[PDB]
Design a protein around this nucleic acid. Structure first.
Ligand SMILES: [Mg+2]
Ligand SMILES: [Mg+2]
Ligand SMILES: [Mg+2]
Ligand SMILES: [Mg+2]
Ligand SMILES: [Mg+2]
Ligand SMILES: [Mg+2]
Ligand SMILES: [Mg+2]
Ligand SMILES: [Mg+2]
Ligand SMILES: [Mg+2]
Ligand SMILES: [Mg+2]
Ligand SMILES: [Mg+2]
Ligand SMILES: [Mg+2]
Ligand SMILES: [Mg+2]
Ligand SMILES: [Mg+2]
Ligand SMILES: [Mg+2]
Ligand SMILES: [Mg+2]
Ligand SMILES: [Mg+2]
Ligand SMILES: [Mg+2]
Ligand SMILES: [Mg+2]
Ligand SMILES: [Mg+2]
Ligand SMILES: [Mg+2]
Ligand SMILES: [Mg+2]
Ligand SMILES: [Mg+2]
Ligand SMILES: [Mg+2]
Ligand SMILES: [Mg+2]
Ligand SMILES: [Mg+2]
Ligand SMILES: [Mg+2]
Ligand SMILES: [Mg+2]
Ligand SMILES: [Mg+2]
Ligand SMILES: [Mg+2]
Ligand SMILES: [Mg+2]
Ligand SMILES: [Mg+2]
Ligand SMILES: [Mg+2]
Ligand SMILES: [Mg+2]
Ligand SMILES: [Mg+2]
Ligand SMILES: [Mg+2]
Ligand SMILES: [Mg+2]
Ligand SMILES: [Mg+2]
Ligand SMILES: [Mg+2]
Ligand SMILES: [Mg+2]
Ligand SMILES: [Mg+2]
Ligand SMILES: [Mg+2]
Ligand SMILES: [Mg+2]
Ligand SMILES: [Mg+2]
Ligand SMILES: [Mg+2]
Ligand SMILES: [Mg+2]
Ligand SMILES: [Mg+2]
Ligand SMILES: [Mg+2]
Ligand SMILES: [Mg+2]
Ligand SMILES: [Mg+2]
Ligand SMILES: [Mg+2]
Ligand SMILES: [Mg+2]
Ligand SMILES: [Mg+2]
Ligand SMILES: [Mg+2]
Ligand SMILES: [Mg+2]
Ligand SMILES: [Mg+2]
Ligand SMILES: [Mg+2]
Ligand SMILES: [Mg+2]
Ligand SMILES: [Mg+2]
Ligand SMILES: [Mg+2]
Ligand SMILES: [Mg+2]
Ligand SMILES: [Mg+2]
Ligand SMILES: [Mg+2]
Ligand SMILES: [Mg+2]
Ligand SMILES: [Mg+2]
Ligand SMILES: [Mg+2]
Ligand SMILES: [Mg+2]
Ligand SMILES: [Mg+2]
Ligand SMILES: [Mg+2]
Ligand SMILES: [Mg+2]
Ligand SMILES: [Mg+2]
Ligand SMILES: [Mg+2]
Ligand SMILES: [Mg+2]
Ligand SMILES: [Mg+2]
Ligand SMILES: [Mg+2]
Ligand SMILES: [Mg+2]
Ligand SMILES: [Mg+2]
Ligand SMILES: [Mg+2]
Ligand SMILES: [Mg+2]
Ligand SMILES: [Mg+2]
Ligand SMILES: [Mg+2]
Ligand SMILES: [Mg+2]
Ligand SMILES: [Mg+2]
Ligand SMILES: [Mg+2]
Ligand SMILES: [Mg+2]
Ligand SMILES: [Mg+2]
Ligand SMILES: [Mg+2]
Ligand SMILES: [Mg+2]
Ligand SMILES: [Mg+2]
Ligand SMILES: [Mg+2]
Ligand SMILES: [Mg+2]
Ligand SMILES: [Mg+2]
Ligand SMILES: [Mg+2]
Ligand SMILES: [Mg+2]
Ligand SMILES: [Mg+2]
Ligand SMILES: [Mg+2]
Ligand SMILES: [Mg+2]
Ligand SMILES: [Mg+2]
Ligand SMILES: [Mg+2]
Ligand SMILES: [Mg+2]
Ligand SMILES: [Mg+2]
Ligand SMILES: [Mg+2]
Ligand SMILES: [Mg+2]
Ligand SMILES: [Mg+2]
Ligand SMILES: [Mg+2]
Ligand SMILES: [Mg+2]
Ligand SMILES: [Mg+2]
Ligand SMILES: [Mg+2]
Ligand SMILES: [Mg+2]
Ligand SMILES: [Mg+2]
Ligand SMILES: [Mg+2]
Ligand SMILES: [Mg+2]
Ligand SMILES: [Mg+2]
Ligand SMILES: [Mg+2]
Ligand SMILES: [Mg+2]
Ligand SMILES: [Mg+2]
Ligand SMILES: [Mg+2]
Ligand SMILES: [Mg+2]
Ligand SMILES: [Mg+2]
Ligand SMILES: [Mg+2]
Ligand SMILES: [Mg+2]
Ligand SMILES: [Mg+2]
Ligand SMILES: [Mg+2]
Ligand SMILES: [Mg+2]
Ligand SMILES: [Mg+2]
Ligand SMILES: [Mg+2]
Ligand SMILES: [Mg+2]
Ligand SMILES: [Mg+2]
Ligand SMILES: [Mg+2]
Ligand SMILES: [Mg+2]
Ligand SMILES: [Mg+2]
Ligand SMILES: [Mg+2]
Ligand SMILES: [Mg+2]
Ligand SMILES: [Mg+2]
Ligand SMILES: [Mg+2]
Ligand SMILES: [Mg+2]
Ligand SMILES: [Mg+2]
Ligand SMILES: [Mg+2]
Ligand SMILES: [Mg+2]
Ligand SMILES: [Mg+2]
Ligand SMILES: [Mg+2]
Ligand SMILES: [Mg+2]
Ligand SMILES: [Mg+2]
Ligand SMILES: [Mg+2]
Ligand SMILES: [Mg+2]
Ligand SMILES: [Mg+2]
Ligand SMILES: [Mg+2]
Ligand SMILES: [Mg+2]
Ligand SMILES: [Mg+2]
Ligand SMILES: [Mg+2]
Ligand SMILES: [Mg+2]
Ligand SMILES: [Mg+2]
Ligand SMILES: [Mg+2]
Ligand SMILES: [Mg+2]
Ligand SMILES: [Mg+2]
Ligand SMILES: [Mg+2]
Ligand SMILES: [Mg+2]
Ligand SMILES: [Mg+2]
Ligand SMILES: [Mg+2]
Ligand SMILES: [Mg+2]
Ligand SMILES: [Mg+2]
Ligand SMILES: [Mg+2]
Ligand SMILES: [Mg+2]
Ligand SMILES: [Mg+2]
Ligand SMILES: [Mg+2]
Ligand SMILES: [Mg+2]
Ligand SMILES: [Mg+2]
Ligand SMILES: [Mg+2]
Ligand SMILES: [Mg+2]
Ligand SMILES: [Mg+2]
Ligand SMILES: [Mg+2]
Ligand SMILES: [Mg+2]
Ligand SMILES: [Mg+2]
Ligand SMILES: [Zn+2]
Lengths: 59, 122, 204, 118, 131
RNA sequence: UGUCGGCUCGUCGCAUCCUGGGGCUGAAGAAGGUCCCAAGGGUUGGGCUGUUCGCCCAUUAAAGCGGCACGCGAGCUGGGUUCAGAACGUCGUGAGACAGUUCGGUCUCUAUCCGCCACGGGCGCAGGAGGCUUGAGGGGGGCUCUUCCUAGUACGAGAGGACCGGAAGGGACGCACCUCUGGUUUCCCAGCUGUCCCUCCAGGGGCAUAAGCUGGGUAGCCAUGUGCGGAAGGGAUAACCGCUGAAAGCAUCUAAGCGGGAAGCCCGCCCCAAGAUGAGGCCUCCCACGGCAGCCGGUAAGGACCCGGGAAGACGACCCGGUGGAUGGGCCGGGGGUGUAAGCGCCGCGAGGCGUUGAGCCGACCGGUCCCAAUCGUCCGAGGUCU
RNA sequence: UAGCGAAAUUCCUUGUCGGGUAAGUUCCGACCUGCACGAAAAGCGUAACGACCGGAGCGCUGUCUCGGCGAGGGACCCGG
């Protein structure tokens, strides 16, 4: 290895075009069928402690 | 799977005891020689006043190998030593006897005089 | 030019005339026709085949209408056999007879990102004598200032497997109509349970 | 390639992984419900279910086998006298795993809970 | 579908059942059909079975014997139509399933390490008494 | 602009080493000699020496010659040579000197651009969709030997020995595969040592490696193992050989015209491929929704998100499944590996042995079973431009 | 001069002969036409010693034919 190195400073255009795929995707949330609170699917509701229509965890 | 540098026990009464492969006579570039293959070999150890001497470059035919030899009948066969028998340019055995068993593949490859001289063909 | 869809089931060997002959067992039939490609309507001759029955709940309305147009139950796989036209409406293993020579097409086993030595059987490097961190690397890939680039199609590292592979001229060892089984002599691409197509051989 | 290789490695060598499964089996068989990461959770099930079924068998051979992994004689006595009987008619599935809502702050680890069935 | 059932089903016609059971360590005489020229005879192979592979119909076993001062090993398929018969000539007791080590032992040490299985010998004599 | 040689990786030229097709021969045959066409494929292993080269050994159809910064050190090597040490021969009064010989002597983790191998995201292909496809254009592949029958015939004094046609068997190479053969198999089983511990006996666990050591070993991934490929055939030709035939009453393969003729070219075979913006074709599905070729909003066919997963996989993509369900985990059966568990009885003073017992344990493989876990759901998504 | 010599020196040079090897520009033993050894910048030998530098053999090996599988720490994905 002979220490590869950038040949030219990247133009703002090129670095931002490279970053064109960096946008976050927003979370995935559904309403809990008990307290109607938005929560991730297939998780136990952290606002009421219910999942599959029963208590599992003290909230 | 005999290749160059492999040591073979001679199983006849030619006076040789150990030969060393130096070429497989089987096309321009064979990698391995199994039962029934003719090879060129340098004699490395011999008893005194034999038919051949150490340093003689002779042709031999392999009769049993330490690798197993697969057969169409689904079976295989394997021996405890890689052994050969010295021969002349007419496929005849140069010695008068052979020692130990030889493999049956030889009969397919036209070595009837070695098969007859065998104590047991397996 | 006859063909049929099927699924590779597994490998074994049988005994025919004091000879152990290796076989691949393929579950071919039965396969009904769902469309026929004609020169006047489509431009060429072919026969669209269906394989494996499917739960109708899992079939969507366009495919459902397609099946229904032929009066054919829902099916999991639809694959075409070109330059074919059976007289019936259902292809079974009966089309193949013992001794017939066939080509089988399957999806090879995927080896993922593959090194140059597994992909292209490269020699790699020395495992000693100073060889510094290149016991599996490909070595040089070009010349110098001339031509000053790399050839197209240069053998390199990358994905390998899960590609279409056709093995040709495999003898039909046996056929079992009762079980829709097809016993071929040799190796057939892909894992047990992969989709394979069995066609008549193209080599005289 | 990984074709048809069962079980995880969990970025641990052999003895570390074994001791991980053991310590989690102990903590679970004690508290009845533990909070772990989702992969360790999905892996605990085989260990714990096998031990519980072994305890269901009940003889001395099963007690010694389970004691190989558990070591704690009191915990094994509790497993045979209290935990085993309440699974006499249940065939398998003695454990369950449910995913938790919020991740972990330090590293973003997605958590889950593993508990013994009623 | 059951792919294993299909494999077993294809194998079913060739499965052989008239062959007596044995274990690694028993001394066996296998009467094998052999083509030579221009006939077909039966050559016997008598030796200690050193290994038994198990894959349903693809089970193969290996037999070792000293033949004129040369160690010979033969591998046979249990359901091969070339094995005419198999004859148990001695029951040995091994603490192991694979008997590779007898490739490095003298005959005396071999006799010492693979002594007679008096139990299965008594069981062989216990049968063999037809009515 | 790192200078020899090597290794890896190739690609090109043809003044062709071999394989193919020819003419002439001081070509009887077999075998050679010479020139013509041909770059499709192929062109071995080893001894010497840093060597390239060359010589040699054993083979071969053959062991071709060259270009690519005497191809290739941000790919490796560093033996040669070309820093500092030391010595020999020789030169110089000497400091030192020769490339003359000799021993030794730091080769730099991170690839921005082009390029190359793989792989996604976006948009477009005028309505939006689920499938199935054509193949423009590409790549791959392209090799060869032995024996036998013809026939010991044609030919030759004899040795020796065919064309043409017809079988069988190899070497290397390529693609796939795991039935067999053979490996691995990181905890699947058993044995063994030392020490510490649970619990004293028994029985067990930790550590001696990131398996403590040994004897084995499934599925998988694998070659040494197995299957299969090179073609067949068609078309146009190269050298070359003709038919018919003038110019030129003869003659001429040519000026008109027509045949025969290469491992070479075009198709044929396998693979990629409609970003082929020239954005193809076919089957089927949805539909004229409201407000103001455009915009906003709810839908349809459908699709994505999430979840259980997968011989699929770096991620993402692909493919399967989501309680209307066998996707994973558990459990049961079978396969399979290990090879007679603990306990008790019996024998022995004892180490141990026997019986219970092919026992006990037991990952991946082929199955069964709702026991557990894929609960509950949400967001996108056509109103079809103009002649 | 003694002694030594194709040598840690020999250009021609892989000198020639012999030994070892199937094959040996290296190695060992010889000859002497010493380009250009030679006797305290010592000459020729020397038991023992050497992480020095040559040559050959036995053993044993993934150095190799020729590669394959497995383990772990990175590399790959997410959070800081
Ligand atoms: Mg470098
Ligand atoms: Mg770099
Ligand atoms: Mg470095
Ligand atoms: Mg790099
Ligand atoms: Mg760097
Ligand atoms: Mg900037
Ligand atoms: Mg800018
Ligand atoms: Mg950029
Ligand atoms: Mg900006
Ligand atoms: Mg609260
Ligand atoms: Mg002998
Ligand atoms: Mg000698
Ligand atoms: Mg397919
Ligand atoms: Mg590689
Ligand atoms: Mg490959
Ligand atoms: Mg390879
Ligand atoms: Mg290598
Ligand atoms: Mg090397
Ligand atoms: Mg180095
Ligand atoms: Mg290294
Ligand atoms: Mg490289
Ligand atoms: Mg460079
Ligand atoms: Mg250029
Ligand atoms: Mg892929
Ligand atoms: Mg049959
Ligand atoms: Mg994979
Ligand atoms: Mg790996
Ligand atoms: Mg699985
Ligand atoms: Mg584990
Ligand atoms: Mg896994
Ligand atoms: Mg995982
Ligand atoms: Mg980590
Ligand atoms: Mg850790
Ligand atoms: Mg450890
Ligand atoms: Mg540890
Ligand atoms: Mg389990
Ligand atoms: Mg959950
Ligand atoms: Mg924190
Ligand atoms: Mg989450
Ligand atoms: Mg099977
Ligand atoms: Mg069935
Ligand atoms: Mg006999
Ligand atoms: Mg014996
Ligand atoms: Mg019979
Ligand atoms: Mg030319
Ligand atoms: Mg020629
Ligand atoms: Mg010629
Ligand atoms: Mg000629
Ligand atoms: Mg002549
Ligand atoms: Mg001639
Ligand atoms: Mg002549
Ligand atoms: Mg000429
Ligand atoms: Mg060429
Ligand atoms: Mg060439
Ligand atoms: Mg050479
Ligand atoms: Mg050498
Ligand atoms: Mg040597
Ligand atoms: Mg060399
Ligand atoms: Mg050398
Ligand atoms: Mg030279
Ligand atoms: Mg020759
Ligand atoms: Mg010739
Ligand atoms: Mg070149
Ligand atoms: Mg030059
Ligand atoms: Mg250069
Ligand atoms: Mg060169
Ligand atoms: Mg360069
Ligand atoms: Mg170079
Ligand atoms: Mg470079
Ligand atoms: Mg270099
Ligand atoms: Mg550079
Ligand atoms: Mg080097
Ligand atoms: Mg150097
Ligand atoms: Mg040097
Ligand atoms: Mg030099
Ligand atoms: Mg130098
Ligand atoms: Mg130097
Ligand atoms: Mg120097
Ligand atoms: Mg010196
Ligand atoms: Mg001097
Ligand atoms: Mg001078
Ligand atoms: Mg002077
Ligand atoms: Mg002077
Ligand atoms: Mg000077
Ligand atoms: Mg100077
Ligand atoms: Mg040194
Ligand atoms: Mg370098
Ligand atoms: Mg640097
Ligand atoms: Mg970096
Ligand atoms: Mg970059
Ligand atoms: Mg650029
Ligand atoms: Mg795209
Ligand atoms: Mg194009
Ligand atoms: Mg094309
Ligand atoms: Mg082409
Ligand atoms: Mg004749
Ligand atoms: Mg012919
Ligand atoms: Mg052939
Ligand atoms: Mg298998
Ligand atoms: Mg295997
Ligand atoms: Mg096997
Ligand atoms: Mg095996
Ligand atoms: Mg264990
Ligand atoms: Mg104790
Ligand atoms: Mg202990
Ligand atoms: Mg401790
Ligand atoms: Mg440790
Ligand atoms: Mg251990
Ligand atoms: Mg083993
Ligand atoms: Mg092992
Ligand atoms: Mg295995
Ligand atoms: Mg191979
Ligand atoms: Mg072939
Ligand atoms: Mg023609
Ligand atoms: Mg004429
Ligand atoms: Mg004429
Ligand atoms: Mg003309
Ligand atoms: Mg013509
Ligand atoms: Mg013509
Ligand atoms: Mg003609
Ligand atoms: Mg042609
Ligand atoms: Mg050809
Ligand atoms: Mg296609
Ligand atoms: Mg396409
Ligand atoms: Mg399109
Ligand atoms: Mg264009
Ligand atoms: Mg289209
Ligand atoms: Mg069309
Ligand atoms: Mg919907
Ligand atoms: Mg779906
Ligand atoms: Mg749902
Ligand atoms: Mg539901
Ligand atoms: Mg399931
Ligand atoms: Mg299941
Ligand atoms: Mg099971
Ligand atoms: Mg069983
Ligand atoms: Mg078993
Ligand atoms: Mg016992
Ligand atoms: Mg017991
Ligand atoms: Mg007593
Ligand atoms: Mg007793
Ligand atoms: Mg079982
Ligand atoms: Mg059911
Ligand atoms: Mg349920
Ligand atoms: Mg909901
Ligand atoms: Mg004087
Ligand atoms: Mg001299
Ligand atoms: Mg000399
Ligand atoms: Mg001297
Ligand atoms: Mg010197
Ligand atoms: Mg000079
Ligand atoms: Mg010289
Ligand atoms: Mg010299
Ligand atoms: Mg010389
Ligand atoms: Mg010379
Ligand atoms: Mg000499
Ligand atoms: Mg000599
Ligand atoms: Mg000599
Ligand atoms: Mg040397
Ligand atoms: Mg002289
Ligand atoms: Mg001198
Ligand atoms: Mg001096
Ligand atoms: Mg002086
Ligand atoms: Mg000395
Ligand atoms: Mg020293
Ligand atoms: Mg010292
Ligand atoms: Mg040695
Ligand atoms: Mg290696
Ligand atoms: Mg590896
Ligand atoms: Mg690894
Ligand atoms: Mg790792
Ligand atoms: Mg790893
Ligand atoms: Mg990060
Ligand atoms: Zn809630």
């Amino acid at each position: 290895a002979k220490h590869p190195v950038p040949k030219k400073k990247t133009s703002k255009a090129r670095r931002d075009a490279r970053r064109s795929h960096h946008a976050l995707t927003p979370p995935i949330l559904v309403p809990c069928p008990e307290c109607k609170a938005m929560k991730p699917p297939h998780t136990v509701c952290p606002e009421c402690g219910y999942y599959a229509g029963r208590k599992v965890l003290e909230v | 799977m005999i290749q160059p540098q492999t040591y073979l026990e001679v199983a006849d009464n030619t006076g040789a005891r150990k030969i060393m492969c130096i070429r497989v006579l089987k096309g321009s570039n064979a990698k391995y020689a199994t039962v029934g293959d003719v090879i060129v070999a340098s004699v490395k150890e011999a008893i005194p006043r034999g038919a051949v001497k150490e340093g003689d470059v002779v042709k031999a035919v392999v009769v049993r190998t330490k690798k197993e030899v697969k057969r169409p009948d689904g079976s295989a066969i394997r021996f405890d030593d890689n052994a050969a028998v010295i021969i002349n340019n007419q496929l005849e055995p140069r010695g008068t006897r052979v020692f130990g068993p030889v493999a049956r593949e030889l009969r397919e490859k036209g070595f009837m005089k070695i098969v007859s001289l065998a104590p047991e063909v397996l | 030019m006859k063909g049929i869809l099927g699924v590779k089931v597994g490998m074994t060997r049988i005994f025919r005339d004091d000879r152990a002959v290796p076989v691949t067992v393929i579950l071919a039939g039965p396969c009904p026709v769902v469309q026929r490609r004609t020169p006047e309507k489509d431009g060429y001759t072919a026969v669209q085949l269906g394989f494996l029955p499917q739960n109708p709940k899992r079939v969507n309305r366009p495919l459902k209408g397609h099946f229904a147009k032929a009066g054919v139950e829902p099916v999991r796989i639809l694959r075409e056999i070109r330059d074919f036209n059976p007289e019936g409406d259902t292809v079974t293993v009966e089309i193949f007879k013992p001794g017939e020579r066939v080509d089988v097409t399957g999806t090879s086993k995927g080896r993922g990102f593959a090194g140059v030595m597994k992909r292209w059987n490269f020699a790699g490097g020395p495992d000693s004598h100073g060889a510094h961190k290149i016991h599996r690397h490909p070595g040089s890939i070009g010349n110098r200032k001339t031509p000053g680039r790399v050839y197209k199609g240069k053998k390199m590292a990358g994905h390998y497997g899960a590609e279409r592979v056709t093995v040709m001229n495999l003898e039909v060892v046996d056929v079992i109509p009762e079980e829709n089984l097809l016993l071929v002599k040799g190796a057939v691409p892909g894992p047990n349970g992969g989709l394979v197509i069995v066609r008549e051989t193209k080599k005289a | 390639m990984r074709h048809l290789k069962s079980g995880r490695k969990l970025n641990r060598h052999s003895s570390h992984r074994l001791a991980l499964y053991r310590n989690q089996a102990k903590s679970l068989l004690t508290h009845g419900r533990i909070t772990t990461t989702v992969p360790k959770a999905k892996e605990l099930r085989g260990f714990v279910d096998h031990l519980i079924h072994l305890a269901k068998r009940g003889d001395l051979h099963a007690r010694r086998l389970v004691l190989r992994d558990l070591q704690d004689v009191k915990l094994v006595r509790k497993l045979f006298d209290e935990i085993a009987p309440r699974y006499r008619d249940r065939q398998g599935g003695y454990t369950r795993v449910l995913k938790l809502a919020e991740r972990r702050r330090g590293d973003g680890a997605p958590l889950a809970l593993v508990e013994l069935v009623e | 579908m059951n792919r294993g059932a299909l494999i077993k089903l294809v194998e079913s016609r060739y499965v052989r059942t008239d062959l007596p059971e044995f274990r690694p360590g028993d001394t066996v005489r296998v009467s094998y059909k052999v083509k030579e020229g221009n006939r077909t005879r039966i050559q016997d192979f008598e030796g200690i079975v050193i290994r038994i592979r198990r894959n349903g119909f693809n089970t193969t076993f290996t037999v070792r014997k000293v033949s004129y001062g040369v160690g010979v090993e033969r591998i046979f398929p249990l359901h091969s139509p070339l094995i005419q018969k198999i004859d148990i000539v001695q029951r040995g007791r091994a603490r192991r399933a694979k008997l590779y080590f007898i490739r490095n032992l003298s005959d005396r040490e071999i006799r010492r390490k693979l002594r007679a299985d008096r139990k299965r010998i008594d069981k062989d004599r216990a049968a063999e008494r037809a009515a």
